Scaffold this active site. Structure first.
Site: not given
Lengths: 124, 124
Positions: A12, A41, A119-121
């Site tokens: 990210h 992905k 984590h990219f939410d």
């Protein structure tokens, strides 16, 4: 064994430049980050701010995460991002993506010591 | 005035071949790139990837540099490279090298605005 923090950075972070410059940014970046290696992905966001600025989000607006945990944080400011989404006709091993640049708040889960994004939410 | 960034490209890029395939590659290249002018540069590595793929490494895995600095970066993927190492019986001005081709992750040091490669640190 890649850490969750490191994974976040590989998936990210792109502090190279402030903008995705080319329609082909996603094709290059998805590949340079190992995200077309075994499968395409489908969806991925890259954030074009300094690591320091993204790590600082962990001391900004606390919010719930999609999974129900409460270790998520929304950036107070908008950030330069690029959304990468696989095309409808994309098929591994010829992964194809459409690149979309945006300025939006990011929401990350933060954890560990140092207390960093893991984590990219979402972007909002 | 050759910039540090242009020096790296001279010393370490060679995006024309996918590999080496040729025992005389380092003898030719080390000379051709001005690496045997004042002495025989003892070791050197050329990278056979696009310039944008090597410049993208400066946003990839941050790792300590061999000299202890913090501005080194390891590619997430492997890259085609050629190591050149001076032979035992090499005597300047007739510099001689063993040519070895490999597919290894590279580690580069990055500096500047724009943040670009300036030193080749290691391969792993």
């Amino acid at each position: 064994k890649e850490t969750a923090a490191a994974k976040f950075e590989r998936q990210h972070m792109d502090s190279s430049t402030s903008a995705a410059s080319s329609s082909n940014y996603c094709n290059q970046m998805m590949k340079s980050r190992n995200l077309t290696k075994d499968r395409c992905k489908p969806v991925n966001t890259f954030v074009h701010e300094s690591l320091a600025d993204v790590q600082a989000v962990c001391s900004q607006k606390n919010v719930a995460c999609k999974n129900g945990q409460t270790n998520c944080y929304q950036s107070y400011s908008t950030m330069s991002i690029t959304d990468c989404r696989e095309t409808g006709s994309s098929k591994y091993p010829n992964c194809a993506y459409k690149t979309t640049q945006a300025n939006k708040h990011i929401i990350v889960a933060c954890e560990g010591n140092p207390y960093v994004p893991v984590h990219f939410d979402a972007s909002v």
